[PDB]
Design a protein around this ligand. Structure first.
Ligand SMILES: *[C@@H]1O[C@H](CO[C@@H]2O[C@@H](C)[C@@H](O)[C@@H](O)[C@@H]2O)[C@@H](O[C@@H]2O[C@H](CO)[C@@H](O)[C@H](O)[C@H]2NC(C)=O)[C@H](O)[C@H]1NC(C)=O
Ligand SMILES: *[C@@H]1O[C@H](CO[C@@H]2O[C@@H](C)[C@@H](O)[C@@H](O)[C@@H]2O)[C@@H](O[C@@H]2O[C@H](CO)[C@@H](O)[C@H](O)[C@H]2NC(C)=O)[C@H](O)[C@H]1NC(C)=O
Ligand SMILES: *[C@@H]1O[C@H](CO[C@H]2O[C@@H](C)[C@@H](O)[C@@H](O)[C@@H]2O)[C@@H](O[C@@H]2O[C@H](CO)[C@@H](O)[C@H](O)[C@H]2NC(C)=O)[C@H](O)[C@H]1NC(C)=O
Ligand SMILES: *[C@@H]1O[C@H](CO[C@H]2O[C@@H](C)[C@@H](O)[C@@H](O)[C@@H]2O)[C@@H](O[C@@H]2O[C@H](CO)[C@@H](O)[C@H](O)[C@H]2NC(C)=O)[C@H](O)[C@H]1NC(C)=O
Ligand SMILES: *[C@@H]1O[C@H](CO[C@@H]2O[C@@H](C)[C@@H](O)[C@@H](O)[C@@H]2O)[C@@H](O)[C@H](O)[C@H]1NC(C)=O
Ligand SMILES: *[C@@H]1O[C@H](CO[C@@H]2O[C@@H](C)[C@@H](O)[C@@H](O)[C@@H]2O)[C@@H](O)[C@H](O)[C@H]1NC(C)=O
Ligand SMILES: *[C@@H]1O[C@H](CO)[C@@H](O)[C@H](O)[C@H]1NC(C)=O
Ligand SMILES: *[C@@H]1O[C@H](CO)[C@@H](O)[C@H](O)[C@H]1NC(C)=O
Ligand SMILES: *[C@@H]1O[C@H](CO)[C@@H](O)[C@H](O)[C@H]1NC(C)=O
Ligand SMILES: *[C@@H]1O[C@H](CO)[C@@H](O)[C@H](O)[C@H]1NC(C)=O
Ligand SMILES: *[C@H]1O[C@H](CO)[C@@H](O)[C@H](O)[C@H]1NC(C)=O
Ligand SMILES: *[C@H]1O[C@H](CO)[C@@H](O)[C@H](O)[C@H]1NC(C)=O
Ligand SMILES: [Cl-]
Ligand SMILES: [Cl-]
Ligand SMILES: [F-]
Ligand SMILES: [F-]
Ligand code: NA
Lengths: 527, 527
């Protein structure tokens, strides 16, 4: 029986058998007042404290969210859907600790992705028990509000100020500062890690003065705030809040009255109308996302980054070889997970309309010109591959690289990876390659489980990744020092060295997507 | 009576009074066999030698060429038209020497512009008597063949090998090497200078192994071989030669027979058909220009420049503030030298069609996007100014800057100027500004003549320019060392310092047209 006394009460955890050893899991610890009734759309409020023992023995409710119903019965999409009941009562976190209890362990805090619209910490690919067992780190993950319930903004108004989901995260970081020593954790050694919107979130905690003293270091997998999907403008937010109001019968003259009306709606009515708050959307739409609220974010985050206004610490950042492919089957014509998706020039052009809904004709033409100078072959898969790269480069790779360049310019050590291994178990077709989201299982050590039918090369790759992430968290340096591994060099603005991650041979390379990112980064912000 | 014994015979010159002093002029010395009959389209042949005295007492015939008839009676255009009879018998040069005869004077050799289609050394703005008088340099200038008669190419065929006009120039440089000591000149101190196509020519002598030992240093005013108008492709040349053949009734199966037929045509029939050898032309058309002949030019000159295959010496290069404006009244809709030429967006778009006849729609749109981001005003002269800058930047400024960057990268001192003074006497309207061609009169010292109604500030500016050019020719360093002048810094690829030339204040500036040239240089060669 494992009982830990926290600041707000006692919690009971449970023992898990992992790799002939033991891990203690505390699943579903509350970290804030349930944001119900009048607390809907507000910043999370602190917890009241309890006598008796909270049983943290199962994963808690996931936050309200729409679900991916595109491919019922299909593991590739369904694996990302929530696996616990949905509820507004969802502000809970999970703690995995090694056994025996550690003395002063480094802490890894996971922040999930899902476009700020979806996600939960209870997914099987975020199970922190392997990391705890193998590296003797403590792993923490939290549920934070998503969609309108987490990000609705009527800027400056404390009834709906925006960024609530980010304040949920921040309050979980505070819980860790205050409570993790009780669990054998070192609050002075805390590394945030996250993927996609989780990685964007981690990058915003780097920018937020309120988050400064709540963590040590940061890991950004496939995401950063400067991605074009990551921050909603005040103009967009206002329009989208007002659209939601109109759609739910909540239009009012008085804005505080709008919010009052919205707090009376069933959460299901809110979810149902989220997709419609924009005239046109893309498979990458973030209808309700982070905004400049003058609280969590004091200024436009691009300005903050450019001018060095961020936490000075080490970062580990990376992307996957085929970031863009996953999104192509959610609306690009000619694409299907169930065939090789050879598309024509015309289909490619229609695809750009899907992903760049406007975007001038000139803008779309410039994309076409840059990405379809076939050298050369023809080569039926030309257009198919081009559209994937457009989407991955614009949305994930070039922003991650620009983030890393601009961050490192202020003197800190940054390390960049390019993940190029496709899971032997991937249920998506071969043409999709090394997909967005599919490094996560390697980071969390799932291929370390021999019962699981990953290859031996995958076990080795995962073990190596796990060691490098742990060494980054503990020591600020993502090396694997014992098995004559390639040294991961620091990424600097001149030279821009990065490390490739794959089963055959780890390589030091330079200037990832140099030509492509010159297009997106230097030219396309104008168009 | 002034008689000089040359390698090929005695020449008599004439005495000129200049600024209360004397200059000896030898106008119209032959330097090659007249390229008539069977010598038409061939490289120039050496001169036979003569007894008795050649009277070099007037300017010789100008080479056959079409004339600018756009504005009869108008000095601004007519000043560029030939002022001596046109003849195929035109291979003559001029020598001005100070009096008393110098002992070992530095030599400046002028190569005129005119798009390789027109020009003559006898123009009043190329009169070398002021330079000789004021700086005690020797000035030489030659007539070289222009148009088809100078540049017709059927590559590899000695009957019409291309580049004949460039070999004319080269043979005049040889004449100088062999003869200038007789006139008090130093063949080891020879500086080439030229403007527009003359400057492009100077840059090609830098690349030509045959010209290497024929000069010391080089000055490039408003031109360089990498300008888009400066070198004809082998494909274009062949098509244009064949088109000329078709147009003159000279189409044949045998190519040597084509040339034989062309040698029978009256030169007037050739001139008449030159404009038509291309389906569409621009006000900047160079129908018959330099080509890669494997003789004068051994490889594509861009490759030679990139890879450092050129004469290692100092260069002085520059451009005028409004290079592009002169061409706009030769076909852009809405433009007139006789009004302020306020054009609309649609007219601007039509203008691009005139100057970029194809050039995809995307290409033309990209130009529009880059040059019409009004910041901001509106501001009726927006489009008018934009089209001038497009034409000047693409055709003259960005190529001159890229030439200077690439040249200086191989270790030599380069000096770059930006000429921003508009002649008080300019007969063109004010909207045309600091025009192409209108620094030349300042270089040649015409404003030093007080009788001429230039301002006092212009006399001073000209005197300063003349000293800097002379110091560049004599010493490789374009300084004016005596009157507390701004030091002209070396232009280096990092930093890219240049000197502005104007009547108020000479400034050291950096990175001329940085944004515009990034567009033309990095992006537009693709489109
Ligand atoms: C801001 O919102 C307006 C209105 O959005 C419409 O009504 C909402 C309640 C919701 O149902 C949306 O899906 C509707 O589009 C947008 O105005 C629309 O713009 C499109 C242009 O693509 C136009 O064809 C529609 O007719 C407009 N609808 C109305 C009612 O005027 C507007 O585009 C949004 N502003 C943005 C995105 O900046
Ligand atoms: C190469 O030349 C051909 C033929 O040129 C035509 O005939 C010549 C004698 C002369 O009179 C030219 O002005 C004529 O254009 C070009 O073929 C023409 O191309 C245009 C496309 O703009 C087309 O509309 C015409 O019908 C074509 N004319 C013929 C007779 O076929 C061709 O464009 C040139 N190649 C180039 C510029 O690369
Ligand atoms: C790959 O499949 C796509 C997607 O749509 C199809 O999925 C197939 C697996 C099959 O079940 C089929 O019935 C289903 O429609 C194909 O694109 C479709 O092509 C048709 C032409 O008949 C269009 O009318 C559809 O709109 C279009 N769908 C989409 C979403 O664009 C695609 O042709 C196929 N590609 C191959 C075989 O290379
Ligand atoms: C400036 O003049 C141009 C050029 O053409 C005109 O020149 C004038 C000085 C005058 O002699 C006039 O008769 C002559 O046509 C004007 O552009 C012209 O505008 C007319 C509209 O009637 C068009 O039909 C012509 O095609 C067009 N010419 C060209 C070459 O494009 C221009 O409008 C005028 N601009 C002003 C006053 O701002
Ligand atoms: C736990 O260790 C603390 C020091 O942590 C280390 O130094 C900080 C600055 C970070 O770099 C972190 O990564 C390191 O692990 C001590 O202050 C603290 O007292 C320790 N607590 C114990 C032993 O109970
Ligand atoms: C003329 O002077 C010659 C040297 O010229 C100088 O050095 C060369 C290399 C160039 O740098 C040039 O600019 C200089 O002016 C002598 O070789 C030659 O003999 C002199 N001739 C005379 C005095 O009759
Ligand atoms: C928590 O679980 C333990 C089972 O060991 C039980 O004793 C206790 O009553 C539980 N508390 C609950 C369900 O509230
Ligand atoms: C390093 O090597 C050992 C022994 O060969 C192996 O068991 C382990 O998996 C490797 N460690 C890491 C961190 O990759
Ligand atoms: C050259 O000019 C002089 C005039 O001084 C004259 O003596 C001589 O005969 C002339 N030669 C000609 C015209 O061929
Ligand atoms: C320098 O100054 C003198 C005397 O003031 C003047 O006559 C001359 O024009 C100037 N020289 C140059 C080369 O500009
Ligand atoms: C609108 O008036 C109501 C009246 O109760 C009140 O909530 C508030 O003062 C007003 N709204 C705002 C946003 O100030
Ligand atoms: C074409 O034949 C003629 C026959 O006299 C001759 O000039 C030459 O050998 C041929 N042309 C070429 C270019 O070889
Ligand atoms: Cl098309
Ligand atoms: Cl338009
Ligand atoms: F590794
Ligand atoms: F000066
Ligand atoms: Na472009």
């Amino acid at each position: 029986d494992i009982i830990i006394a926290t600041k707000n009460g006692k919690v009971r955890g449970m023992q898990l058998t992992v790799f002939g050893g033991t891990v203690t899991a505390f699943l579903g610890i509350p970290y804030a007042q349930p944001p119900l009734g009048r607390l809907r759309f507000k910043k999370p409020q602190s917890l009241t404290k309890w006598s008796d023992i909270w049983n943290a023995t199962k994963y808690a409710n996931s936050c309200c969210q729409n679900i991916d119903q595109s491919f019922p019965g299909f593991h590739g999409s369904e694996m990302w859907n929530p696996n616990t009941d949905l509820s507004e009562d969802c502000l809970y976190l999970n703690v995995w600790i090694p056994a025996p209890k550690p003395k002063n362990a480094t802490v890894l805090i996971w922040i999930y992705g899902g476009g700020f619209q979806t996600g939960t910490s209870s997914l099987h690919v975020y199970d922190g028990k392997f990391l705890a067992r193998v590296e003797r780190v403590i792993v923490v993950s939290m549920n934070y509000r998503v969609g309108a319930l987490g990000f609705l903004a009527l800027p400056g108004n404390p009834e709906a100020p925006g960024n609530m989901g980010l304040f949920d995260q921040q309050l979980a970081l505070q819980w860790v500062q205050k409570n993790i020593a009780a669990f054998g954790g070192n609050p002075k050694s805390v590394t945030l890690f996250g993927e996609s919107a989780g990685a964007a979130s981690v990058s915003l905690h780097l920018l937020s003065p309120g988050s400064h003293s709540l963590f040590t270091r940061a890991i950004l997998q496939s995401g950063s705030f400067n991605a074009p999907w990551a921050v909603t403008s005040l103009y967009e937010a206002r329009n989208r809040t007002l659209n939601l109001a109109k759609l739910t019968g909540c239009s009012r003259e008085n804005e505080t009255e709008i919010i009052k009306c919205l707090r009376n709606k069933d959460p299901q009515e809110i979810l149902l109308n989220e997709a419609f708050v924009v005239p046109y959307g893309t498979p990458l739409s973030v209808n309700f996302g982070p905004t400049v609220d003058g609280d969590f974010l004091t200024d436009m985050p691009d300005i903050l980054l450019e001018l060095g206004q961020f936490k000075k610490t080490q970062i580990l950042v990376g992307v996957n070889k085929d970031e863009g492919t996953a999104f192509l089957v959610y609306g690009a014509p000619g694409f299907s997970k169930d065939n090789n998706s050879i598309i024509t020039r015309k289909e490619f052009q229609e695809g750009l309309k899907i992903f760049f809904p406007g975007v001038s004709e000139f803008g779309k033409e410039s994309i076409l010109f840059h990405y379809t100078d076939w050298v050369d072959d023809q080569r039926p898969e030309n257009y198919r591959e081009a559209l994937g790269d457009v989407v991955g480069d614009y949305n994930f790779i070039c922003p991650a690289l620009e983030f890393t360049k601009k961050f490192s310019e202020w003197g800190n050590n940054a390390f960049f990876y390019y993940f190029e291994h496709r899971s032997s178990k991937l249920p998506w077709p071969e043409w999709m390659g090394v997909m967005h989201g599919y490094e996560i299982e390697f980071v969390f050590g799932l291929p370390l489980e021999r019962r699981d039918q990953y290859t031996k090369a995958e076990e080795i790759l995962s073990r190596s990744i796990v060691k490098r992430w742990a060494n980054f968290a503990k020591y600020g340096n993502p090396q694997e020092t014992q098995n004559q591994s390639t040294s991961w060099p620091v990424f600097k603005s001149t030279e821009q060295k990065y490390l490739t991650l794959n089963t055959e041979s780890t390589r030091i390379m330079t200037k990832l997507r140099a030509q492509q990112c010159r297009f997106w980064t230097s030219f396309f912000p104008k168009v």
